[PDB]
Ligand binder design. Structure first.
Ligand SMILES: *[C@@H]1O[C@H](CO)[C@@H](O)[C@H](O)[C@H]1NC(C)=O
Ligand SMILES: *[C@@H]1O[C@H](CO)[C@@H](O)[C@H](O)[C@H]1NC(C)=O
Ligand SMILES: *[C@@H]1O[C@H](CO)[C@@H](O)[C@H](O)[C@H]1NC(C)=O
Length: 438
């Protein structure tokens, strides 16, 4: 009941919202200065949703380590008391790689939500649906289609007996697949180590004080900074992996302070910003393939792209139709970051400080948790309005209207379609894709 379909996960918000890309979806609608509502005189005539998979178990790699770390903590320490008591017996049972029940329900909820927001179109148009190829992404796509389909059947205004919505195209993640949802072919970018550098540098400014404290309180234990981030990682996973998702915050969370959570969140924004966003020279270039596919869709014209798009897939109406009206894509956090930036959506954001925390104002609305949480969603709309001949484009990022850049925005955050497309000259020129090889 603090976890709803509409508002996302609002339980324990002072902690749970600062887990970055480990935070469960939470709607930013209340944080939107521009109203998400459709203005009067205006009609939505296009809706594309780009969605992340839902909450997942830790990867096999990381879980090994977590499990290993907690054994070592239990073998060595002589006082587990106060807030530490739970660690004595803690019995690591978490799954691996897979979506969690909670993660599953998130995408069901995203499906209901999408159905309803665009009801006057979802009632009789079957969306064209794509998915990167990874069990968790595919499954999440299908949990979204599941909830969309449940809402459609309860809707008196639906045209019933249309074909199912389904995953029309699973896009491959093999190292040689042109994949626009999360490209894997830009050799120089794949090799980049800028994110690591920033991660190490910024963790040296705040993790040592926590390490000290934790070794102090758990006599006999000796910890690396990395291990400390693992115990922080566990506060997300131990919360949203069990029954108690809605009722109890993980005991792990209480071992760190609010301010310590603030740094954690910001760290995660840094990993994403310098890994895949603007802070990485080739990051937004990872998004140009998808940006050119969106342009195709908005202009009902062929894809012009020579970066990450597959040409067999795109030059064929069956696998890339131009006049559907609704579209749903499912991918990972990393590719979604690159896409958001290639679209200009964060072009009023100043490169994040590598040394100090920057609040959500200083970053002009950018953070991991505000962009790619678990089950995140981007909605691109096109609407036709009373006062104007041309279609107006609008973009929401987890229920927050995000004012377009690179074109004459109005006060409602919108640009005319022609001027929006024109502003995406970066993607239209191929970005820096040529630098993937020299
Ligand atoms: C393009 O997609 C096709 C059809 O799914 C696939 O068999 C082929 O490998 C793809 N080519 C690349 C470079 O991804
Ligand atoms: C526990 O003790 C072992 C063996 O002395 C040591 O190498 C290890 O790093 C310690 N680990 C922790 C997490 O305290
Ligand atoms: C956004 O700013 C970046 C900064 O490099 C620029 O490359 C790009 O053309 C801009 N995009 C838009 C849509 O204005």
């Amino acid at each position: 009941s603090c976890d709803t379909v509409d508002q996302g996960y609002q339980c324990f918000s002072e902690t749970s919202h600062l887990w970055g890309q480990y935070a469960p979806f939470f709607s930013l609608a209340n944080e939107s200065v521009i109203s998400p509502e459709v203005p009067a005189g205006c009609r939505v005539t296009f809706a594309q949703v780009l969605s992340r998979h839902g909450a997942r178990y830790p990867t096999d790699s990381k879980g090994k380590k977590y499990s290993a770390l907690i054994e070592e903590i239990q073998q060595n320490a002589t006082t587990f008391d106060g807030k530490y008591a739970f660690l004595k017996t803690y019995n690591y049972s978490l799954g691996a790689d897979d979506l969690t029940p909670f993660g599953e329900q998130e995408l069901v909820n995203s499906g209901i939500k999408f159905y309803q927001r665009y009801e006057s179109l979802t009632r009789n148009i079957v969306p064209f649906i794509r998915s990167s190829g990874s069990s968790r992404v595919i499954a999440s796509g299908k949990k979204f289609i599941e909830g969309f389909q449940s809402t459609k059947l309860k809707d008196p205004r639906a045209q019933p007996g249309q074909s199912s919505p389904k995953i029309d195209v699973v896009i491959s993640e093999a190292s040689s697949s042109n994949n626009t949802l999360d490209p894997g072919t830009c050799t120089v970018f794949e090799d980049s180590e800028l994110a690591d550098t920033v991660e190490a540098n910024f963790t040296a400014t705040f993790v040592p004080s926590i390490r000290q404290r934790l070794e102090n309180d758990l006599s006999g234990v000796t910890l690396t900074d990395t291990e400390v981030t693992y115990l922080m990682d566990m506060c997300s996973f131990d919360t949203i992996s069990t029954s108690t998702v809605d009722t109890k915050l993980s005991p792990f969370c209480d071992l760190f302070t609010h301010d310590e959570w603030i740094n954690y969140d910001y760290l995660q924004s840094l990993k994403k910003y310098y890994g895949h966003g603007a802070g990485n020279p080739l990051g937004p270039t990872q998004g140009v393939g998808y940006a050119n596919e969106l342009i195709a869709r908005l202009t009902h014209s062929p894809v012009h792209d020579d970066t990450s798009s597959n040409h067999t897939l795109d030059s064929s109406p069956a696998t890339f139709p131009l006049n559907s009206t609704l579209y749903a894509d499912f991918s990972h956090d990393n590719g979604i970051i690159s896409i958001l930036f290639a679209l200009g959506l964060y072009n009023g954001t100043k490169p994040l400080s590598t040394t100090t925390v920057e609040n959500i104002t200083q970053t002009d609305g950018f953070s991991s948790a505000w962009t790619v949480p678990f089950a995140s969603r981007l909605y691109v709309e096109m609407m036709q309005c009373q006062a104007e001949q041309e279609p107006l484009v609008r973009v929401l990022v987890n229920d927050r209207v995000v004012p377009l850049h690179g074109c004459p925005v109005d006060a409602l955050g919108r640009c005319t379609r022609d001027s929006f497309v024109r502003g995406l000259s970066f993607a239209r020129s191929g970005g820096d894709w040529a630098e993937c090889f020299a």
